[PDB]
């Protein structure tokens, strides 16, 4: 997880999900793509 | 069985307040005459005890009754013991009925009389001004003329028609 003001999907396997009141980018193929809304 | 403007019942379909239906003006006009006649007969037959009145006098309103005292804050140009009529009566009330002017009751309906019993002056009223650091200080004393009135009688006549 890296904090990001602007969330961007970095590959086709990235999916946007809103959890605990904020948006997240999750990626199983490339876990490094994981991002947290700041 | 649904009209063009029908709305199913919801929390906001209709206003919160209940619907009020006022009486038919024709039917109510007859009811009003009955009430006025009933109260008028109470006056003719003297079915009232002590009366009170709201009178406008010297710019302000006074709720009064027989034997009351009121302190007028100015001179009236009347000798002590002189009897006068208070001509501006907004309200006259009894135990079981009340009459309201719009805004003043007719002079035929009610007569309020009063007597001047004292003409004097108020206790000294200090007027002082002060502003810090400006050598600004002044004092004045004023005594205001006053008149004491006794309400002698409140009388009503059966002139409600």
């Amino acid at each position: 997880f890296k904090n990001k003001t602007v969330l961007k999907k970095r590959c086709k396997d990235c999916y946007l999900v809103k959890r605990r009141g904020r948006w997240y980018v999750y990626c199983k193929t490339h876990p490094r793509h994981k991002q947290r809304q700041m | 069985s649904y009209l063009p403007g029908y709305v199913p019942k919801t929390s906001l379909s209709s206003p919160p307040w209940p619907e009020v239906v006022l009486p038919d003006p024709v039917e109510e006009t007859r009811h009003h005459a009955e009430v006025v006649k009933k109260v008028n007969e109470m006056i003719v037959t003297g079915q009232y005890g002590r009366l009170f009145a709201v009178v406008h006098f010297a710019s302000r309103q006074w709720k009064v009754t027989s034997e009351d005292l009121i302190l007028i804050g100015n001179e009236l140009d009347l000798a002590c013991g002189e009897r006068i009529r208070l001509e501006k009566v907004l309200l006259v009330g009894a135990d079981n009925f009340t009459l309201l002017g719009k805004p003043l009751l007719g002079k035929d309906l009610v007569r309020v009389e009063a007597t001047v019993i004292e003409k004097t002056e108020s206790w000294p009223r200090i007027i002082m001004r002060f502003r810090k650091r400006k050598n600004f200080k002044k004092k004045r004393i004023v005594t205001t003329p006053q008149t004491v009135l006794r309400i002698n009688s409140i009388e009503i006549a059966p002139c409600l028609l």
Binding site: - | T29, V54, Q61, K63, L91, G93, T98, L100, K102, F130
Partner: protein, 99 residues
């Protein structure tokens, strides 16, 4: 100096007291203070707040009558506003004209 300036506050505080007392009496009859005062004016009843507060304490039956009158005039206002002018003026809504 305090005695001099207090004459302004005395008048202000007295009227606040009357409004509080009138508000209390009005709520006993299910009326808010602005509804009573506003609608009494529309009936050409010019009783001031000092007298109205006195009536609430010492003439409770007269005050209920005044509260009823204001409530009646208030409902007449609603009926008129809802209508499109077809309805004649309310019985208590008629104003006595002077000249």
């Amino acid at each position: 100096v305090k005695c001099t300036k207090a004459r302004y506050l005395k008048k202000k505080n007295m009227r606040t007291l009357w409004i509080n007392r009138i508000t209390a009496a009005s709520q006993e009859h299910g009326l808010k203070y602005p509804a009573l005062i506003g609608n009494l004016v529309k009936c050409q009843v010019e009783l001031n707040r000092k007298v109205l507060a006195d009536l609430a304490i010492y003439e409770p039956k007269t005050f209920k009558s005044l509260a009823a009158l204001a409530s009646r005039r208030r409902h007449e206002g609603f009926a008129a506003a809802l209508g499109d002018g077809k309805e004649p003026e309310g019985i208590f809504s008629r104003v006595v004209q002077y000249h």
